[PDB]
Structure 1
Amino acid sequence: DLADLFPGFGSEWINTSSGRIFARVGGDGPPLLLLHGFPQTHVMWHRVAPKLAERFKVIVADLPGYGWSDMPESDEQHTPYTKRAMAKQLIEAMEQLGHVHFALAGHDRGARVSYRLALDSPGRLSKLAVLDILPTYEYWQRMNRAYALKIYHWSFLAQPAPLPENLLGGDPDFYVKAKLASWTRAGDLSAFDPRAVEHYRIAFADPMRRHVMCEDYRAGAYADFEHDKIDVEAGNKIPVPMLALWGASGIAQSAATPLDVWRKWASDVQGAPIESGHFLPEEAPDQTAEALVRFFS
């Protein structure tokens, strides 16, 4: 079966109006919500969450539609898998636990939920950390030949259904393992705990979960972009103190200098590179956990 990678952490099924959020919960102290991205689940935090649980109440959540969270039915505008909708759902989930003001760190898609949360509902966040992303608007505005080859999956997974679903279903194991490996510094799976890979692979083997991931990327090409575009053309900046962390060999540093971009989006931003590919908490767990503890405390 699937391994428990958070020894001592509790498990919670949090009801919301859009379905249940699964989370592991551990620690004590100020609340800290950790959000994963694609093609992973909450267990990507398993190397950094124990160190964070020494100082914080750490809630490690599967995104709406991911992992063991429920999958709301999507619609023609991919509404439940827009980051605006996901942020609202997670705000609800945290309200169910009594957390109306919390710290938040996200990676990949979860970092896109995080900064959208901070634009829409800044009063909910004490501090924000985003790992190896630039805003969705910035990726699309920088989509030239070199970047279109590098993050082809942004345009491939956003193709109308069922085109990417039908291609992904012939050999799902190949695709999830290809994405994990190709975005690491070494280019293989050595940075990952093999028990964590099994979580990712099992989640990706469900065709409904794969459809959700495509809906996430469809939202990323359309409504998420439009939502971002409104803010940046209006000069709306994130007022929450924030940390932008990126991998020297990761995705965000390709096609832009991350700190200069985030300073356009956030009034109070600090940044640091980490020698790592895209998967900061697994490739560089110690370095990531130390940056996060220092920033949040």
Structure 2
Amino acid sequence: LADLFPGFGSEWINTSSGRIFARVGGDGPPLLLLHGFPQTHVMWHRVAPKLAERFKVIVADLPGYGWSDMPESDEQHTPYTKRAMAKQLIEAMEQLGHVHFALAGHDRGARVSYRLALDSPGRLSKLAVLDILPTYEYWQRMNRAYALKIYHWSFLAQPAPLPENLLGGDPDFYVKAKLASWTRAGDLSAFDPRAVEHYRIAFADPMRRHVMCEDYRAGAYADFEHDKIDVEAGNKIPVPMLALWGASGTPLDVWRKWASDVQGAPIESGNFLPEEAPDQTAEALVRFFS
């Protein structure tokens, strides 16, 4: 497995739920970067250097993903809910002395991020969310067309062991197919092969696949109900925010229902912005967080 973060250290950070792995580089204001599915912290490798020109950049594996430890789940999927993941990453950040920080997330990491902002806004200076709408909004949309497009939201959320059993036969196919599927190009040409190797090795472990299914189970159930409470309360995130999304993968209208200070923009890309459009993404983030 290649080292894709020149000038970054490697830390295991203790929490009450298990270790969080991160790569850590730069100096200046702290900025936490959170990946999504079916990826690891490595997805930030094309943008984390430009950010580390200005910031102390902490590139963390989500609870249960990558090299982070895997807390034991329960019947309500609790450690893999975005509320619980957020709490665990807040504890991790406190081990480094960071109690007020900038945050950018992608895909499931973006879900952690906006949930963290909703639950504990005082922890964040500024928030960026990449390639998502709120969980609740995806579910509200979920008609025929959306059920076909984002079938994995319902498939991965099926009770165990249904998706686990299917995934075990040829996991390398499935993960590579998802990576390719969600890009504009429809192939793996947007990704560094060494990055793809990281994602494949993680996905090859049954215990890591189980976590991903627990994440999607939470997304179907507790995450949705948590979001529904905020929508019904009319709670909006107060933290200055940026929404970026791949134009092939409005979203600003949606976010304005969830956040009182939000700017954003499409970038021509599929759903892997930091790898498909690294310069544009790095530039939008540096300019937003600076």
Which category of TM-score, normalised to the shorter sequence, fits these structures?
over 0.9
Summarize deviations over 1:33-70 as a string: whole Å, max 9, x none: 00000000000000000000000000000000000000
Summarize deviations over 1:54-104 as a string: whole Å, max 9, x none: 000000000000000000010000000000000000000000000000000
- Structure 2 residue matching 1:230: 3-state secondary structure: helix
Looking at structure 2, the residues matched to 83 and 245 of structure 1 have their Cα atoms a distance apart, in angstroms, of 20
| Structure 2 residue ranges without an equivalent (≥5) | none
Cα drift, residue 7 of structure 1: 1.2
Summarize deviations over 1:99-155 as a string: whole Å, max 9, x none: 000000000000000000000000000000000100000000000110110000000
Looking at structure 1, the residues matched to 202 and 8 of structure 2 have their Cα atoms a distance apart, in angstroms, of 21
Cα drift, residue 223 of structure 1: 0.1
- Structure 1 residue matching 2:38: 3-state secondary structure: coil
- Structure 2 residue matching 1:133: 3-state secondary structure: coil
The Cα RMSD (Å) is: 0.3
- Structure 2 residue matching 1:244: 3-state secondary structure: strand
- Structure 2 residue matching 1:12: 3-state secondary structure: strand
Correspondence list, 1:1-297, <5 A: 2-250=1-249, 257-297=250-290
Summarize deviations over 1:153-199 as a string: whole Å, max 9, x none: 00000000000000000000000001000000000000000000000
Looking at structure 2, the residues matched to 48 and 158 of structure 1 have their Cα atoms a distance apart, in angstroms, of 31
Looking at structure 1, the residues matched to 139 and 49 of structure 2 have their Cα atoms a distance apart, in angstroms, of 36
Sequence identity percentage: 100
Looking at structure 2, the residues matched to 282 and 261 of structure 1 have their Cα atoms a distance apart, in angstroms, of 24
Looking at structure 2, the residues matched to 188 and 32 of structure 1 have their Cα atoms a distance apart, in angstroms, of 31
- Structure 1 residue matching 2:12: 3-state secondary structure: strand
Looking at structure 1, the residues matched to 161 and 73 of structure 2 have their Cα atoms a distance apart, in angstroms, of 13
Looking at structure 1, the residues matched to 6 and 230 of structure 2 have their Cα atoms a distance apart, in angstroms, of 41
Looking at structure 2, the residues matched to 187 and 286 of structure 1 have their Cα atoms a distance apart, in angstroms, of 20
Looking at structure 1, the residues matched to 177 and 156 of structure 2 have their Cα atoms a distance apart, in angstroms, of 15
- Structure 2 residue matching 1:210: 3-state secondary structure: helix
- Structure 1 residue matching 2:142: 3-state secondary structure: coil
Looking at structure 1, the residues matched to 237 and 17 of structure 2 have their Cα atoms a distance apart, in angstroms, of 26
TM-score by length of 1: 0.97
Summarize deviations over 1:202-258 as a string: whole Å, max 9, x none: 0000000000000000000000000000000110000100000000011xxxxxx10
Cα drift, residue 281 of structure 1: 0.3
Looking at structure 2, the residues matched to 233 and 211 of structure 1 have their Cα atoms a distance apart, in angstroms, of 32
Looking at structure 2, the residues matched to 292 and 50 of structure 1 have their Cα atoms a distance apart, in angstroms, of 12
- Structure 1 residue matching 2:129: 3-state secondary structure: strand
Looking at structure 2, the residues matched to 230 and 118 of structure 1 have their Cα atoms a distance apart, in angstroms, of 15
Looking at structure 1, the residues matched to 230 and 133 of structure 2 have their Cα atoms a distance apart, in angstroms, of 14
- Structure 1 residue matching 2:189: 3-state secondary structure: coil
Summarize deviations over 1:236-288 as a string: whole Å, max 9, x none: 000100000000011xxxxxx10000000000000100000000000000000
How many residue pairs are counted as aligned between the two chains?
290
- Structure 2 residue matching 1:243: 3-state secondary structure: strand
Looking at structure 1, the residues matched to 138 and 6 of structure 2 have their Cα atoms a distance apart, in angstroms, of 37
Looking at structure 2, the residues matched to 187 and 172 of structure 1 have their Cα atoms a distance apart, in angstroms, of 18
Cα drift, residue 8 of structure 1: 1.5
Looking at structure 1, the residues matched to 240 and 50 of structure 2 have their Cα atoms a distance apart, in angstroms, of 22
Looking at structure 2, the residues matched to 157 and 201 of structure 1 have their Cα atoms a distance apart, in angstroms, of 18
Report runs of 4+ in structure 1 exceeding 2 Å deviation.
none
Looking at structure 1, the residues matched to 246 and 198 of structure 2 have their Cα atoms a distance apart, in angstroms, of 23
Looking at structure 1, the residues matched to 82 and 170 of structure 2 have their Cα atoms a distance apart, in angstroms, of 28
Cα drift, residue 3 of structure 1: 0.2
1:253 is aligned to: none
| Structure 1 residue ranges without an equivalent (≥5) | 251-256
